[PDB]
Design a protein around this nucleic acid. Structure first.
Lengths: 96, 154
RNA sequence: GGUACGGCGGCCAUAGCGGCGGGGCCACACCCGGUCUCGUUUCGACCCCGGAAGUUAAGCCCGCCAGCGUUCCCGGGUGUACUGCCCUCCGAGAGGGGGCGGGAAACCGGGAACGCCGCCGGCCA
RNA sequence: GGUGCCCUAAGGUCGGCUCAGGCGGGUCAGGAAUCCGCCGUAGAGUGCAAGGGCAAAAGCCGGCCUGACUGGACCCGUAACAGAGGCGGGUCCAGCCGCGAAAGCGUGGCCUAGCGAACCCCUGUGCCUCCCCGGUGGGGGCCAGGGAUGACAGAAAAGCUACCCUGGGGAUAACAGAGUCGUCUCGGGCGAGAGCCCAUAUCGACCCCGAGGCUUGCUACCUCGCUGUCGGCUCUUCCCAUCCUGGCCCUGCAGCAGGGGCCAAGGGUGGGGGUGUUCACCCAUUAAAGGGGAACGUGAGCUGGGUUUAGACCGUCGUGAGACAGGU
RNA sequence: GGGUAGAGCACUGAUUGGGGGUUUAGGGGGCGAAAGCCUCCGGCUCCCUGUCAAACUCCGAACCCACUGCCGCCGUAGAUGGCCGGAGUAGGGGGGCGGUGUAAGCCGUCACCCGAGAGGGGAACAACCCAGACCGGGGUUAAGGCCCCAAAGUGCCGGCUAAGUGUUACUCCAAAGGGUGUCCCUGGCCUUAGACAGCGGCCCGUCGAGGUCAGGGGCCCCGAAAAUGGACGGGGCUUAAGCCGGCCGCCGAGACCCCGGCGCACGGACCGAUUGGUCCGUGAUCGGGUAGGCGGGCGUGCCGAUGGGGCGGAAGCCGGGCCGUGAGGUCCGGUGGACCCGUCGGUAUUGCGGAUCCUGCC
RNA sequence: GCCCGAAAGGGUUGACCCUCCCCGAAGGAAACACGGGCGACCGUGGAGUACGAGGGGAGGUGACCGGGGUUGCACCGUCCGUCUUGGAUCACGGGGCAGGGAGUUCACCCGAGCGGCGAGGUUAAGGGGGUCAACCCCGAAGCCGCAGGGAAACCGACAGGUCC
């Protein structure tokens, strides 16, 4: 049967943890800062449900083009299209 | 070192990546030969096209013969001792010796075409086009034995 | 310069769990009371308040133990299982073989490991 | 495997605490449970499925509250890449507020299901407007909420045709062909054993390996105005997987006979009764009265009994018109 | 960044047997004076042994994806990209991968081919092998092949097969189980007398030289029955014209090399009544094509202009030549007896093989 | 191979054919002298010679050639149009010949190739003249544009300040 895409479809593994992390992350990640032009990996922490991008884009690398509130504005390319996301720094990781 | 690559097989019934890599190597047609410098970035592409080409390490005398008999300039004009002696200060044997053992690039000749277009081998390929040279066939890595084949194709 | 002293942290088990043995100006705890601050759907036990007669026994500090768990290394297992590309190779078929490239898991034997780093303070002399 | 809900708390926030089970202690029939200690990485619990997440909590126990609000902006998904009305979610700016010592959090439910265009209508709210001008009653417009289309991107909606018609279709059934062989038919391996005793004269379990495409099914490659017909009569030819006729072998072969096997397809294999029958059943003879293939051979060769076109009767079903892979 | 293959039992759930400890959640009885102090078939917690997972994971590839820098390729002869406009396409198939299904098939996926793709081979063959095609010539190779049909070997060396087995890369080939039929590699027990073969009650004289049991491989044999007359493509082939392990020369495409000719694309120079032309340069990186888009040319009837032809014979018709890729143009001869053509610019009932097309003739 | 010819095609101002000299792309021999290999064969030198598409020259000869009709031998070749994944099909249409026979016109909208005027552009109906359906002059009514936003009442802007 045909089934539409939703936020948590086929996310069993990708939004799961190994049972030796299991909880609140350390706080450096919560308190990261970023500059415009910095490349960032999109890596979702499944224990924090605010500022969560669609898991479809988990594993990609984008560029920061600004801030709004505590969230950063990240651009990616999907085909020819450019897409824009508001992501909490906990779901992000810098390149290098 | 300098590697000589000869194209042996058709691209009908090959994958598009293979076709594109051969085009990047300037090996568009059968029985065409290119000279390349040995590096990881070229070795990867060779490994990708391994089943459509032969390759090996070329020698200075064979390179000089090849420059004299099949070397061409823009316009498909042939290369001559006088042209060389003029635009540079060597003979062909000296230029090719250098090119082989470093110290000069082929491109250092103005208006030199990078593709050597050969004729098929005298007496035939002495192996099957469907197999590797090591197991008795024609395809893949030779060594100094690529020079024997070039001479038959020259 | 010293101190078997303490506060705020980082990396989050090579740091844990457990066992053994040692210590007390300063310090850190346990300890006695509860009128008052706060409170016990009953107990001043726990939280809070007031202070030290008194204790090194516990926590804490110090050193050790390879017992459990954890991470790393060398060698075997083994270039084994699996696998990307090509094949007028085999085989009735399934399924296998050859060339060029990648490459485990269990298990076995032998070694390292019973935390590392940052900031400011206190006390003795 | 679940939803088309439920909750003034199961919503917001602050504080404090830690679960299931097991063991050892006591009153108790299974005892549901109340009491004490230890161990104990979550085995518990969470408004609800499944998966994910969570331990000085996102769980338990309490206290104060109503951010389950107003005005607006930009993003993601449904619908990758690659277009979308409506729906859902995210990040913020202001306003007015809640919890809190404060930092902070709060735009319902720890995350992902719980619903819906145009046109018309009802309610709230304050403004614009109605044909020369000005009043009164009434009407129209802008904004917000609500009333439904589950065939859920949304017609207001029951049947028969055998008296049937048109346009088309092998994109799609009946039939011959083609494919396949579960099923079927015909075999085999081993040997449980049965046979006075003796595995294999004869019979051979349960498991395992195959041939054929003449039995039925499966599929949908060919053919929709090629011929669509079953059976019988007539006429020709082919196979052997042999009933009789010729020749042999073993036997639980005395003879007469039987049983089981090998070679062999040159010849034979008939006549009648009831039924449309093929088949099957029966009778008298007979050396025996074998079976299959050839578009289930053979309707530009015959027949037309059967095969529910148009007429008619019975039964049954149906309000009825009518129908019946039922009969006449 | 990711949990597939593989692997394993650390979670969830399945699953054999033993050796022990608590005994009982519980019906059976036994000495059961009665659920009894105590045991029997059974539950709980260990240890050793043996098995599993599409909806399990203490582990964990090959591979794929995004991004950074470099190598390579494309790009000022203007890419990537954006705007405007014109479409066609909504029945796909072969081959490889997955799920389902006895299977044939059904449903998806990759995007090499057929569709829309000539030529050389496989006997003929949509998609299996070689190889992508302007024209005229000369050469070398590919796939495969070399007894005759049929271009090129009755080719060479070592060995196997006796069944016409075979003479089949694929499209288009029957097993479980048996035979030591023959050629080979191994391992144990025998062997100065062993396996029988004879005279007699293990052996003396006997024969005297190798024998016997096990495992393994190569080729073949059995298992193996159908309908018109017949298929390694045919003839036929047996130290092969079959098979295995290797080798040596030849034949064979439109592919590759060379010479000449045509066109296209881009750039440039020059000459022009105006969508142009002659020439030069570059082209290993231009030269197949269905639906479909774009560019330039040929032909037909009438008008405004311009140049012309015709009784010393127009149009039309029959037969022949030359030019032109070509659609077509023009000349010669014959028949005929009154009108016709070229160029520039406009206009249109403007081009037929087919509609079970229409009218007429045969 | 048999047959026929016009002269529009060519040709005695030289058809065809024969021999010799020069240059020659890619490609490329053999005999022969030695040697390697059990052999089928190979290497060396002969030799990049002799040849070789083609590009030029010189002499002997003296009349055809190109073409056309029909036909023999060898090699190759399953008609045309159509839907269809797939056509020589036992899928549909298809005896022969000649003439006929299918993207037209108007109104509105979107674009383009060119041309005229230009902050303005353009006339309609109609009228006047003439050599009278052709030609010349007049005629801006209206339409688009020059300022928009807003349901409506209503309100009502940079003819240039900075940078790449």
């Amino acid at each position: 049967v045909k089934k539409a895409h939703s936020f948590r479809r086929k996310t069993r593994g990708k939004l799961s943890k190994h049972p030796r992390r299991r909880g609140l992350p350390p706080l450096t990640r919560f308190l990261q800062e970023f500059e415009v032009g910095q490349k960032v990996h999109i890596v979702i922490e499944p224990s924090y449900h605010k500022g969560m991008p669609d898991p479809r884009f988990h594993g990609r690398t984008g560029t920061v083009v600004g801030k709004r509130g505590d969230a950063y504005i990240v651009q990616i390319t999907d085909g020819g299209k450019v897409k824009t996301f508001f992501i909490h720094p906990v779901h992000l990781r810098p390149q290098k | 070192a300098k590697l000589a690559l000869i194209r042996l097989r058709s691209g009908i019934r090959a994958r598009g990546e293979v076709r594109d890599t051969l085009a990047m190597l300037r090996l568009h047609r059968i029985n065409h030969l290119v000279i390349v410098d040995d590096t990881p970035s070229y070795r990867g592409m060779i490994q990708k096209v391994k089943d459509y080409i032969t390759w090996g390490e070329i020698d200075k005398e064979t390179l000089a013969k090849l420059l004299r008999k099949r070397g061409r300039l823009i316009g498909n004009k042939p290369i001559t001792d006088e042209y060389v002696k003029e635009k540079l200060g060597m003979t062909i044997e000296e230029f090719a010796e250098k090119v082989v053992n470093g110290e000069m690039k082929l491109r250092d000749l103005p208006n030199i075409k990078p593709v050597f277009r050969l004729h098929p081998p005298r007496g035939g390929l002495k192996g099957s086009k469907k197999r590797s040279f090591k197991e008795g066939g024609a395809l893949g890595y030779r060594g100094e034995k690529i020079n024997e084949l070039i001479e038959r194709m020259l």
